[PDB]
Amino acid sequence: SFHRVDQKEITQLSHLGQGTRTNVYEGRLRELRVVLKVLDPSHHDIALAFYETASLMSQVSHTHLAFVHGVCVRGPENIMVTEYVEHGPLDVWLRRERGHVPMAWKMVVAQQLASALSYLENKNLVHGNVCGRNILLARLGLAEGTSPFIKLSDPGVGLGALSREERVERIPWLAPECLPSTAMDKWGFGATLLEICFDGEAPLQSRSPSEKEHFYQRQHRLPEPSCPQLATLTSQCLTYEPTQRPSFRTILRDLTR
Numbered sequence: 191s192f193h194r195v196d197q198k199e200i201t202q203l204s205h206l207g208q209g210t211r212t213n214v215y216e217g218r219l220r221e222l223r224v225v226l227k228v229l230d231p232s233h234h235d236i237a238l239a240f241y242e243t244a245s246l247m248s249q250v251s252h253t254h255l256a257f258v259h260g261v262c263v264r265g266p267e268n269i270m271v272t273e274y275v276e277h278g279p280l281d282v283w284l285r286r287e288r289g290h291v292p293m294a295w296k297m298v299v300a301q302q303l304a305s306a307l308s309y310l311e312n313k314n315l316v317h318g319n320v321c322g323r324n325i326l327l328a329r330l331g332l333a334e335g336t337s338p339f340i341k342l343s344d345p346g347v348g349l350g351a352l353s354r355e356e357r358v359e360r361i362p363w364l365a366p367e368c369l370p371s372t373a374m375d376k377w378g379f380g381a382t383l384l385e386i387c388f389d390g391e392a393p394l395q396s397r398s399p400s401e402k403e404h405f406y407q408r409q410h411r412l413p414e415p416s417c418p419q420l421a422t423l424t425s426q427c428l429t430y431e432p433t434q435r436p437s438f439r440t441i442l443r444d445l446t447r
């Protein structure tokens with residue numbers, strides 16, 4: 191159900207970084223500012239999961255989800271064409287501004303992400319890759335009288351398509367049931383809150399893959415956020431039992447209170 195974009199309409203500009211099995215570039219579509227997510231040459235099973243993401247994203251609309259225009263085919267290159275979100279990934283931005291980002295700013299972002307995940311939950315759709323890298327800043331919201339404005343990115347290559355090693359690499363955003371449903375986004379949401387409160391540094395980042403796996407193997411409790419305003423929420427979200435995690439309806443109602 192994805193849209194087709196033709197090679198003649200897109201211009202590739204500067205390299206922005208890399209995703210899971212992708213190279214990401216600024217681009218131009220026909221003329222719109224866009225981001226081009228170029229899939230590494232891959233087997234059908236990766237290519238399919240890429241196209242499944244493009245389809246899921248073409249079917250949803252939300253003020254806090256970024257837009258996907260479609261997929262272009264440039265020979266062996268599968269390219270997703272997406273909205274350019276002005277100030278880029280949130281985690282990189284928070285690490286730059288660490289010590290400048292007030293608690294109220296982080297609560298706005300938490301409500302905005304919970305709102306987007308609430309809408310996906312009602313559609314019975316799973317994002318699968320909720321992390322700070324996949325949150326993009328449309329408005330910075332640090333100046334006076336301004337509020338930030340985030341937009342959640344597409345999940346990229348789907349979670350079920352990736353390797354065990356890539357899953358270990360996503361700890362602690364990766365829900366523990368996924369190491370060997372909509373409930374996994376509640377874990378990812380809780381981990382992203384820890385990352386946001388820790389100014390873009392997520393727990394267990396310095397640790398090795400076998401250490402990360404050991405943390406999950408022993409079901410060790412993740413840390414508490416650096417603000418009591420979210421300690422209860424993140425604790426309910428970061429429970430190893432998926433059925434004991436709150437719904438996003440509840441999460442959102444608590445964050446606005």
Ligand SMILES: CN(C)S(=O)(=O)c1cccc(-c2c[nH]c3cnc(NC(=O)C4CC4)cc23)c1
Pocket residue numbers: 206207208209210212214225227256257258272273274275276277278279323324325326342343344
């Ligand atoms: C987001 N991922 C981690 S990533 O694609 O692997 C990736 C990796 C590195 C940089 C970017 C990046 C830097 N500046 C952006 C401005 N807008 C966007 N737009 C989108 O992603 C919209 C479809 C959602 C992306 C970037 C993206």
